């Protein structure tokens, strides 16, 4: 697809076996879903910094499906305002800005 | 260009007569940068964030360069742990997401 910018780029994600709608932030190190059951092994991650630190779930390994495409990486568990596509999973789905 | 997501995407900026580096940020509606002078009006806009609202300038219809293409587009002036172009450029310069 390719997705232009005047709105927020909201797209449909399957991960853990629910569809969840997420949000491709460019501007995100890392991909994070509010509370959702995941496989596996986890540890404790500490994210953010500005103002104090938010501790989430690490799973690594996962696999979801972004708008369609298949993509295998690192999903962290934990409150978020809005479910958050980072760049660990675009790289996998080749994902790309173009101007 | 094409950017990929390997690495965080942070391109050259002119903005009032001076360079700056901003990061590509299509999960911001807004474009934001700190240690910047800018001519005009301004109003004050507040932002929420960690422990409430921050205070920051607001000036319309501002020209910038991103990368080597001109937009104008309202621009904010406050702190920020990162210059950040938002949606708002990022439509003016015709930038997709594609994958």
Redesign the interface.
């Known amino acids: ?6 709105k ?2 909201i797209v449909t994600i399957k991960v853990g076996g629910q569809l969840r709608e997420a ?7 890392d991909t994070i879903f509010e509370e959702i059951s995941l496989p596996g092994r986890w540890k404790p991650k500490l994210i ?1 910094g ?3 630190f938010m501790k989430v779930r690490q799973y690594d390994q996962i696999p979801i499906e ?2 369609g ?1 298949q993509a295998i990486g690192t999903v962290l568990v934990g409150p978020t305002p809005i479910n ?1 596509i980072g ?1 660990n999973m ?2 996998q ?7």
């Open positions: 697809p390719q997705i232009t910018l005047w927020r780029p949000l491709i932030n460019t501007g995100a190190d953010g500005i103002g104090g972004i708008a495409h958050v760049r675009l790289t789905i080749g994902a790309t800005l173009n101007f």
